Design a protein around this ligand. Structure first.
Ligand SMILES: [Ca+2]
Length: 135
């Protein structure tokens, strides 16, 4: 893989953060995780979505270094969003959200799945801990 510098522009929600990467503002999708929603037109807000976006916000905002890392497969999805693992001070947000019961592992697509068993290891710990979506 290769980690890269990127600069925070805007945390949209749990799974989506806007970042200046290569000098271009880009929408980035947190690879492998699915967070609850704040806005879904046919839904309203979903349980733990407010605090899933809160979490990521705090995490990318108080960071001194944000780094993105692309996986070994296509790097942009269909809606043109970067496909990546985001590190706030070297800690993987994508992992942090699952360790805290605020994200389930999901849409795991070969070959963009290098870190599938690390996160699938962490969801298991949070489930075993009765935490938040697993409560
Ligand atoms: Ca979602």
């Amino acid at each position: 893989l290769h980690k890269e510098p990127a600069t925070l522009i805007k945390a949209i929600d749990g799974e989506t953060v806007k970042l200046m990467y290569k000098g271009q503002p880009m929408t980035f999708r947190l690879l492998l995780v699915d967070t609850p929603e704040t806005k879904h037109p046919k839904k309203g807000v979903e349980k733990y979505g407010p605090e899933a976006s809160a979490f990521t916000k705090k995490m990318v905002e108080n960071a001194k270094k944000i780094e993105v890392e692309f996986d070994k497969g296509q790097r942009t999805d269909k809606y043109g969003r970067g496909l990546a693992y985001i590190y706030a001070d070297g800690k993987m947000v994508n992992e942090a959200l699952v360790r805290q019961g605020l994200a389930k592992v999901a849409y795991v697509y070969k070959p963009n799945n290098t870190h599938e068993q690390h996160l699938r290891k962490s969801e298991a710990q949070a489930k075993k801990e009765k935490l938040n979506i697993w409560s």
